[PDB]
């Protein structure tokens, strides 16, 4: 208890139909190919999934998730003066947790990775209301990116995959 993001945990447990999901995912994937030519790449659904997707985006394989998580946490420590005003825990306590390989990533980590890699992080998400697939968010630093955006997709509001431009 007392986690920064405690207020997300229960509402995630409540939300949570394999068949309705399965159908939404065909449609998501179709609209993504059809409109952006992007493909969805399946990341393992352990606690590391956000960092798995970033690792796939940055290094080409989700097995580099531990390196990404480590770098992201070092960056957050080095920028604590900024990021600690967005975290309601003791900062060192927060990052200690978040260093653990099964700790789920969140907005704080996505913002840090955008700045740290100097690449915008685009988040894609299926909507039942439209077949549009513009990013729901694009996180970024202030520097001019020389590499393509890091693109992730957010599934069932609880999991991250990799969005590839093939």
């Amino acid at each position: 208890a007392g986690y920064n993001s405690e207020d997300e945990y229960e509402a995630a447990a409540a939300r949570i139909d394999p068949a309705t999901v399965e159908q939404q995912e065909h449609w998501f994937e179709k609209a993504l190919r059809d409109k952006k030519g992007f493909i969805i790449k399946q990341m393992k659904e352990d606690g590391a999934c956000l960092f798995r997707a970033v690792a796939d985006q940055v290094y080409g394989d989700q097995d580099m998730h531990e390196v990404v998580r480590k770098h992201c946490m070092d960056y957050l420590m080095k920028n604590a003066d900024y990021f600690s005003n967005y975290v309601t825990e003791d900062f060192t306590t927060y990052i200690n947790r978040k260093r653990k390989n099964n700790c789920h990533g969140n907005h704080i980590e996505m913002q840090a990775m955008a700045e740290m890699y100097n690449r915008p992080v685009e988040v894609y998400q299926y909507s039942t209301g439209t077949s549009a697939v513009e990013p729901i968010n694009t996180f970024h630093g202030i520097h001019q990116n020389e590499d393509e955006p890091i693109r992730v997709s957010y599934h069932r509001n609880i999991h991250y995959n990799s969005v590839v431009n093939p």
Binding site: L50, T88, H107, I108, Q111, N137, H140, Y154, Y160
Partner: protein, 76 residues
């Protein structure tokens, strides 16, 4: 009175609020300005999470105070 909401997404949002406004009201003003759905919004003042049902006065949030906005995006 005016307050500021500094988003992790990089925006400074200025709001006109009264001391009796709830945190619920404030998230509604942010949806009006920024389009961010209230159930996605976490609001913080001086390192403390704000709860929907409480008022600005409850938190002693004064004129020209700064709040912080983070989005709910946990994934595993």
């Amino acid at each position: 009175m005016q307050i500021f909401v500094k988003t992790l997404t990089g925006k400074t949002i200025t709001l006109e609020v009264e001391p009796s406004d709830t945190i619920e009201n404030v998230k509604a003003k942010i949806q009006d300005k920024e389009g961010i759905p209230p159930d996605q919004q976490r609001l913080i003042f001086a390192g403390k999470q704000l709860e929907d049902g409480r008022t600005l006065s409850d938190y002693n949030i004064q004129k020209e105070s700064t709040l912080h906005l983070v989005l709910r995006l946990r994934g595993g």
